[PDB]
Amino acid sequence: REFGHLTRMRHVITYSLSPFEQRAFPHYFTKGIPNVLRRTRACILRVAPPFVVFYLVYTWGTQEFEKSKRKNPAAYENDK
């Protein structure tokens, strides 16, 4: 596909600078953190309710199976 026939973009003025000059972790801490939380919530705000769905389906399904299985002899009263 090459660089010669991608797309005819016009004016753009890039300003890259060498890694060797600049630090590997520029404000990587205090600046990086808020963005992390900011987008983390951006995912969980949508993703979470499926997690709760799977959670209640898991827990209720498990207790469903166990109550359906172990409790039975008491529920039978074979001494009837």
Catalog residues that contact ligand CDL under the rule CB under 6 A.
28, 32, 35-36, 39-40, 42-43
Q: Which is nearer to ligand CDL, 6 or 36 (CB)?
A: 36
Say if residue 66 is exposed, middle or buried (CB neighbours under 10 Å; 0-12, 13-18, 19+): exposed
Cα angle 22, 26, 27; round to 5: 160
Q: Which is nearer to another protein, 12 or 37 (CB)?
A: 12
The structure tokens listed for 6 are: 């991608």
42 binds, among ligand CDL, another protein, none (CB under 5 to 8 A by kind): ligand CDL
